[PDB]
Design a binder for this molecule. Sequence first.
Ligand SMILES: CCCn1nc(-c2ccc(C(F)(F)F)c(SCCN3CCCCC3)c2)c2c1CCN(C(=O)CC1CCN(C(=O)CN(C)C)CC1)C2
Length: 220
Amino acid sequence: ILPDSVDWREKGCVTEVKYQGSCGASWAFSAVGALEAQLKLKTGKLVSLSAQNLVDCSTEKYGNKGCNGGFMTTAFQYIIDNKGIDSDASYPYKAMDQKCQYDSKYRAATCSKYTELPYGREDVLKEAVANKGPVSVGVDARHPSFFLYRSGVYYEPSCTQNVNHGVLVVGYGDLNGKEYWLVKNSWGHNFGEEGYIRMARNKGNHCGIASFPSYPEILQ
Ligand SMILES: CCCn1nc(-c2ccc(C(F)(F)F)c(SCCN3CCCCC3)c2)c2c1CCN(C(=O)CC1CCN(C(=O)CN(C)C)CC1)C2
């Protein structure tokens, strides 16, 4: 028994679409995105968290290379190890690699744990999005059709399950029988449907959307 559609934006758990620019920081926006929702759930406060904090501070120890890419899971581990992440207000995004300037005075969130979901399992991802909240995922975005996407249910026959771009699954549903994942990107408001893309669901792990899902939690 799961709901047929969910959209975590309607629950006030999704901050504004961000704009990564020419820095490969999608992993960091995916990670803060997922944690922003858990922060809202636990505290009632909706606050954008610092993607730049992760870019600058969750580096070699975490297998991450700032503007040259990273992992959402090891970004979560950084936040756990660091005992904090700064607000985006305090530590705003510059689309470049900088020296780590974390200050605990401006800590806006904490992270207690994270969970990695099994590869390709869109049924388990559906359960997680319904029962836990927005889920950080990777997709195969190396396709002109992705960059040019305007509206509708995205399907790309040449998509692979090898991911290269981090995004956030904030919901799911179906548009007249065509099932989709509701995805928040970090390419600004002029990408897709006001910064969002609806990507084909239950179509064989399309564009690797369920290849590497993960989500953080903030425990009492
Ligand atoms: C072929 C599959 C490998 N892969 N790719 C992603 C994946 C997932 C999401 C994205 C995306 F798109 F969301 F960012 C991407 S893009 C390429 C990122 N890259 C980040 C390193 C720099 C180059 C760019 C890749 C993941 C995987 C394997 C499992 N994942 C994890 O996060 C867990 C790993 C455990 C072992 N690691 C360690 O670092 C162990 N210690 C040394 C710390 C790496 C992480 C997710």
